[PDB]
A paper describes a structure:
Regarding the initial stage, the D3 map was a mixture of four NAD-domain conformations. The NAD-domain conformation with the most open cleft among the four was designated “pre-open” (PROP), because the active-site cleft was narrower than those of the open conformation in the unliganded states. From PROP to CMPX, the tip of the NAD domain travels by 12 Å, and then the volume of the active-site cleft calculated using MoloVol30 will be reduced by approximately 1900 Å3. This volume change corresponds to the exclusion of more than 60 water molecules from the active-site cleft. Maps of almost entire structures of the cofactor molecules were visible in PROP of both stages, and in one of HLOP-α (designated HLOP-α1), and HLOP-β of the steady stage. Therefore, NADPH was modeled for the maps in PROP, HLOP-α1, and HLOP-β, in which the entire structures of cofactor molecules were resolved. In the initial stage, the map in PROP was modeled as two hydration water molecules. One of the two conformers of the Trp89 sidechain prevents the closing motion of the NAD domain and may allow the penetration of hydration water molecules into the pocket to produce [EC1]. In the initial stage, PROP acts as [EC0].
We have been studying the structure and dynamics of a homo-hexameric enzyme, [name] (GDH)18. Each subunit with molecular weight of 46–50 k folds into the core domain for the hexamer formation and the NAD domain to bind a cofactor molecule. GDH existing in both prokaryotes and eukaryotic cells catalyzes the oxidative deamination reaction to convert glutamate to 2-oxoglutarate and ammonia in the presence of the cofactor, such as, nicotinamide adenine dinucleotide phosphate in the oxidized form (NADP). In this study, we analyzed structures of [name] in the initial and steady stages of the reaction using [name] at near-atomic resolution.
Author numbering: 4 to 419
């Protein structure tokens, strides 16, 4: 299924639940600027290889576009366009002064050395300099890209820009030594925890003493479990990895589970815990479920057999639309995927603000501002959900598209 076709279909579906003009929908169905460039680098053997780079800016009505850069051998312009379109709604739902953007290079980084990767980053910056900037387009880490490459890109941009402004703010996800930000490691989990707390508040459920099951124990899953147990006081009873999952009604200690995973290569066979399958974890009777793993783990087949009161879509779309309808019919509140894991984008914006202002905050200030942002966004989505009598995800889409629509109307881009 073509990614851009899917994104356009999603946008039309969202527009079907709100009052939006045809001209605005047509404007939103097409990225405002797409830049495809050749990225030449010098190989370690002395040869020269040319790579294909992309930089799609879907919309900038609300402000400078924001989005990451992906280094995947299967990158396509369609995928970049779809991800920029999704990033637009991602930044619009949580009320950031950002638009939608995305980049990508068709390259396999597993076969490149450190020098070649640095050359690739610098050449990409040299190619796309004319369409990026602190107030035009702010790239970010993505798949097979890390803060190392962010530092290289920032250094190249500063070299080209002759230090005429906040070159630190041109890109986010940088190392702390050069314009970096605190709380970037646990941003997604912190946002998910705040959204879960607000959902419990909305449902009238006290989380102190309740049970939570987390699917996927990577950076997001482990930190979600850890932060839930620490702040929310929720008993973690089940975690899982690719290999399998474990269960214990008496509770799990996330630090010990992480230690065992980093020692035995997997979370399975944890002492005092019963081994369960991922499917079996989705079956447990808990009050919070946090899929932080592979996409499409909840389908029409197992949607009915879910007993969780709150499903926090920490991952990127772990629930299918049929499963969405079935789960909504069962009186279960869903937190949409691009609202639950909004911490990442929310944190990036804080980093950009720190770079622009020249003043960096502390871990507590970032945590409090993120708390405010996520609470406001979830509350703005839940109110739409209750007023329009539509699905949770649909409420978030309505909020984001309404925000973009209003910004477009204010600029005079669309007269209707
Ligand atoms: N973490 C972040 O900063 C943000 C995360 N996201 C989204 O969040 C999710 C996780 O992020 P991230 O922590 O970076 O991912 P990680 O790569 O750090 O970890 C992936 C985890 O999910 C597990 N996993 C991978 N495939 C499966 C599978 N088929 N079945 C069951 N478990 C699987 C991995 O298991 P194993 O360890 O055994 O390999 C691991 O536990 C993703 O869906 C991602 O798209 C996007 C926004 C930013």
């Amino acid at each position: 299924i073509d990614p851009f076709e899917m994104a356009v279909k999603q946008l039309e579906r969202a527009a079907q639940y709100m009052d939006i003009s045809e001209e605005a929908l047509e404007w939103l169905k097409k990225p405002m600027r797409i830049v495809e460039v050749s990225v030449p680098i010098e190989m370690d053997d002395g040869s020269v290889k040319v790579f294909t780079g992309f930089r799609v800016q879907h919309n900038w009505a609300r402000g400078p576009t924001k989005g990451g850069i992906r280094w995947h051998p299967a990158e396509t312009l369609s995928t970049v366009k779809a991800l920029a379109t999704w990033m637009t709604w991602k930044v619009a739902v949580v009320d950031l002064p950002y638009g939608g953007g995305k980049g990508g290079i068709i390259v396999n980084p597993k076969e490149l050395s450190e020098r070649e990767q640095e050359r690739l980053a610098r050449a990409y910056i040299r190619a796309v300099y004319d369409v990026i900037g602190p107030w035009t387009d702010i790239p970010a880490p993505d798949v097979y890209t890390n803060p190392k490459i962010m530092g290289w890109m920032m250094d190249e941009y500063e070299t080209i820009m002759r230090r005429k402004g906040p070159a630190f703010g041109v890109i986010t996800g940088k190392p702390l030594s050069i314009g970096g930000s605190l709380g970037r490691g646990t941003a997604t989990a912190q946002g998910a925890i705040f959204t879960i707390r607000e959902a419990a508040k909305a449902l009238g459920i006290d989380l102190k003493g309740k049970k939570i099951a987390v699917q996927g124990y990577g950076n997001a899953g482990y930190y979600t479990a850890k932060l839930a147990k620490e702040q929310l006081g929720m008993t973690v009873v089940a975690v899982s990895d690719s290999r399998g999952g474990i269960y214990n009604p008496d509770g799990l200690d996330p630090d010990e589970v992480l230690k065992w995973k980093r020692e035995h290569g997997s979370v399975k066979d944890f002492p005092g815990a019963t081994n369960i399958t991922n499917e079996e974890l989705l079956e447990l009777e808990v009050d919070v479920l946090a899929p932080a793993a592979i996409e499409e783990v909840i389908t029409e087949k197992n949607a009915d057999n879910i007993k969780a009161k709150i499903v926090a879509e920490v991952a990127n779309g772990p629930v299918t639309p049929e499963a969405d309808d079935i789960l909504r019919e069962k009186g279960i509140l869903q937190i949409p995927d691009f609202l639950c894991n909004a911490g990442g984008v929310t944190v990036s914006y804080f980093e950009w603000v720190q770079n622009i202002n020249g003043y960096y905050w502390t871990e507590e200030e970032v945590r409090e501002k993120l708390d405010k942002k996520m609470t406001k966004a979830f509350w703005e989505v839940y109110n739409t959900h209750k007023d329009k009598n539509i699905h949770m995800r649909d409420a978030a889409y309505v909020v984001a598209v309404s925000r973009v629509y209003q910004a477009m109307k204010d600029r005079g881009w669309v007269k209707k």
